[PDB]
Design an enzyme around this catalytic site. Structure first.
Site, PDB file in Angstrom:
ATOM      1  N   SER A 198       0.801  -1.219   0.000  1.00  0.00           N
ATOM      2  CA  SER A 198       0.000   0.000   0.000  1.00  0.00           C
ATOM      3  C   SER A 198       0.837   1.273   0.000  1.00  0.00           C
ATOM      4  O   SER A 198       0.267   2.362  -0.125  1.00  0.00           O
ATOM      5  CB  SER A 198      -0.944   0.004   1.202  1.00  0.00           C
ATOM      6  OG  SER A 198      -1.940  -0.993   1.063  1.00  0.00           O
ATOM      7  N   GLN A 208     -11.284  -3.959  -0.659  1.00  0.00           N
ATOM      8  CA  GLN A 208     -10.632  -4.619  -1.778  1.00  0.00           C
ATOM      9  C   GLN A 208     -11.604  -4.761  -2.940  1.00  0.00           C
ATOM     10  O   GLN A 208     -12.800  -4.995  -2.739  1.00  0.00           O
ATOM     11  CB  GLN A 208     -10.108  -6.000  -1.373  1.00  0.00           C
ATOM     12  CG  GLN A 208      -9.192  -5.989  -0.162  1.00  0.00           C
ATOM     13  CD  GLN A 208      -8.755  -7.381   0.246  1.00  0.00           C
ATOM     14  OE1 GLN A 208      -9.073  -8.365  -0.420  1.00  0.00           O
ATOM     15  NE2 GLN A 208      -8.021  -7.470   1.349  1.00  0.00           N
ATOM     16  N   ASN A 233       4.967  -9.937   6.475  1.00  0.00           N
ATOM     17  CA  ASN A 233       3.852  -9.061   6.834  1.00  0.00           C
ATOM     18  C   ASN A 233       3.649  -9.120   8.346  1.00  0.00           C
ATOM     19  O   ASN A 233       2.736  -9.764   8.865  1.00  0.00           O
ATOM     20  CB  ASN A 233       2.593  -9.459   6.073  1.00  0.00           C
ATOM     21  CG  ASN A 233       1.421  -8.539   6.356  1.00  0.00           C
ATOM     22  OD1 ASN A 233       1.590  -7.445   6.894  1.00  0.00           O
ATOM     23  ND2 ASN A 233       0.223  -8.978   5.989  1.00  0.00           N
TER      24      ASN A 233
HETATM   25  C1  LIG Z   1      -2.560  -2.061   1.667  1.00  0.00           C
HETATM   26  O1  LIG Z   1      -1.616  -2.116   2.430  1.00  0.00           O
HETATM   27  C2  LIG Z   1      -3.123  -3.115   1.065  1.00  0.00           C
HETATM   28  C3  LIG Z   1      -2.715  -4.377   1.285  1.00  0.00           C
HETATM   29  N1  LIG Z   1      -3.233  -5.364   0.542  1.00  0.00           N
HETATM   30  C4  LIG Z   1      -2.788  -6.744   0.634  1.00  0.00           C
HETATM   31  C5  LIG Z   1      -3.042  -7.306   2.045  1.00  0.00           C
HETATM   32  O2  LIG Z   1      -4.033  -6.871   2.667  1.00  0.00           O
HETATM   33  O3  LIG Z   1      -2.230  -8.149   2.477  1.00  0.00           O
HETATM   34  C6  LIG Z   1      -3.427  -7.576  -0.482  1.00  0.00           C
HETATM   35  C7  LIG Z   1      -3.170  -6.863  -1.811  1.00  0.00           C
HETATM   36  C8  LIG Z   1      -4.960  -7.648  -0.240  1.00  0.00           C
HETATM   37  N2  LIG Z   1      -5.741  -7.726  -1.465  1.00  0.00           N
HETATM   38  C9  LIG Z   1      -6.418  -6.737  -2.100  1.00  0.00           C
HETATM   39  C10 LIG Z   1      -6.982  -7.341  -3.167  1.00  0.00           C
HETATM   40  N3  LIG Z   1      -6.663  -8.659  -3.160  1.00  0.00           N
HETATM   41  N4  LIG Z   1      -5.907  -8.904  -2.109  1.00  0.00           N
HETATM   42  S1  LIG Z   1      -2.705  -9.237  -0.597  1.00  0.00           S
HETATM   43  O4  LIG Z   1      -3.159  -9.927   0.578  1.00  0.00           O
HETATM   44  O5  LIG Z   1      -3.208  -9.770  -1.831  1.00  0.00           O
END
Ligand SMILES: *C(=O)/C=C/N[C@@H](C(=O)O)[C@](C)(Cn1ccnn1)[SH](=O)=O
Length: 357
Positions: free
Chosen positions: A60, A116, A339
């Site tokens: 992000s 998301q 993470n």
């Molecule tokens: C901001 O920091 C967003 C983070 N997004 C990550 C996460 O939460 O770990 C993803 C991108 C979440 N996401 C959004 C759409 N599909 N997955 S990761 O987990 O794919």
């Protein structure tokens, strides 16, 4: 000098052990010049170490680039945050999109766009049906809900007057002018040797493709380019390009206020000095991902130098964090291939920066 190497070592080394971070790279900006530090491995099985050229998934933190690119388009006269969303996507003929501006998209104040974009949304016609069938929970400019679907749509629409794609616009207007020659939306094949592996519970993973991923969380960079990305936001007046210089200042402008937190274009600011518990506890997802009422700031407060500007980011197996103080000419970047919780990132960053203050 050695004052920096001491505080970084006594802070990051316990953080790496307590969180069991496989690999980490840190850059501290002090009086303009950066200082780099690396620990751990970028590839555990291959035992490849973390270097200054290692690619980390910013997560992000990519939203900071999107906000700066958005502000750059404002300085070029191509967009205004007050313009309706329908001006740049006329096919969005739904009634709920009356009054929703680009500012509402960029600052997560459109009325409750989901965190998301749904997994099934992949084509541009899928994006249209998703936004047409979305029902807001609040009126525009009343509640702030951090959402990739909000600012992600802002980045794709902010580049339409330029005629370039979001990837090409970010390259030719942000990456190249700032000499970020090792920051990519899509990692080239010749650069995969430096693409570090993320680790989610032992398994090596990378970020999977998604709708509007480049605008929200899809940017990867090295610790060298991220340090230069902080120098640009610390001192925007040292950039020759006028629109990019103004775009960085617009990103740090204060548009909404929630408690002692001010929302910018990707960046989030608090007045410095800061109560450390506010930014530490506020970084937890139960607080950061929750909905909060906002108060408009008209006119938007220009980029206040005495501010704590920060942004967390994470993917499946990455955890990044950036924070800088423009008045003190101080900044820090924390890139890790795990993470781990956000409060541990802000707590370590404030301890490092307050000792150098
Ligand atoms: C901001 O920091 C967003 C983070 N997004 C990550 C996460 O939460 O770990 C993803 C991108 C979440 N996401 C959004 C759409 N599909 N997955 S990761 O987990 O794919």
């Amino acid at each position: 000098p050695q004052q920096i190497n001491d505080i970084v070592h006594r802070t990051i080394t316990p953080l790496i052990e307590q969180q069991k971070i496989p690999g980490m790279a840190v850059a501290v900006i002090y009086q303009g010049k950066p200082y780099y530090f690396t620990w751990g491995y970028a590839d555990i099985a291959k035992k490849q170490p973390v270097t200054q050229q290692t690619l980390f998934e910013l997560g992000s933190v990519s939203k900071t680039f999107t906000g700066v690119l958005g502000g750059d388009a404002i300085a070029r006269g191509e967009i205004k945050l007050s313009d309706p969303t329908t001006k740049y996507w006329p096919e969005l003929t739904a009634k709920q999109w009356n009054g929703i501006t680009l500012l509402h998209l960029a600052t997560y104040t459109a009325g409750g766009l989901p965190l998301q974009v749904p997994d099934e949304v992949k084509s541009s016609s899928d994006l249209l049906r998703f936004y047409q069938n979305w029902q807001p929970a609040w009126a525009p400019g009343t509640q702030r809900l951090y959402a990739n679907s909000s600012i992600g749509l802002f980045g794709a629409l902010a580049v339409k007057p330029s005629g370039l794609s979001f990837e090409q616009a970010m390259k030719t207007r942000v990456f190249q002018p700032l000499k970020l020659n090792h920051t990519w939306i899509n990692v080239p094949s010749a650069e995969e040797k430096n693409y570090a592996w993320g680790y989610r519970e032992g398994k090596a993973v990378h970020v999977s493709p998604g709708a509007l991923d480049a605008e929200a969380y899809g940017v990867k960079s090295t610790i060298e380019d991220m340090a230069r990305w902080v120098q640009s936001n610390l001192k925007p007046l040292d950039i020759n390009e006028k629109t990019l210089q103004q775009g960085i200042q617009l990103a740090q402008s204060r548009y909404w206020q929630t408690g002692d937190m001010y929302q910018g274009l990707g960046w989030e600011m608090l007045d410095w000095p800061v109560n450390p518990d506010i930014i530490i506890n506020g970084s937890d997802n139960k607080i950061a991902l929750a909905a909060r009422p906002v108060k408009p700031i008209t006119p938007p407060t220009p980029a206040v130098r005495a501010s704590w500007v920060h942004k967390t980011g994470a993917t499946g197996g990455f955890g990044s964090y950036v924070a800088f103080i423009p008045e003190k000419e101080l900044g820090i970047v924390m890139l890790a291939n795990k993470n781990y919780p956000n409060p541990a990132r802000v707590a370590a960053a404030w301890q490092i920066l307050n000792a150098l203050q």
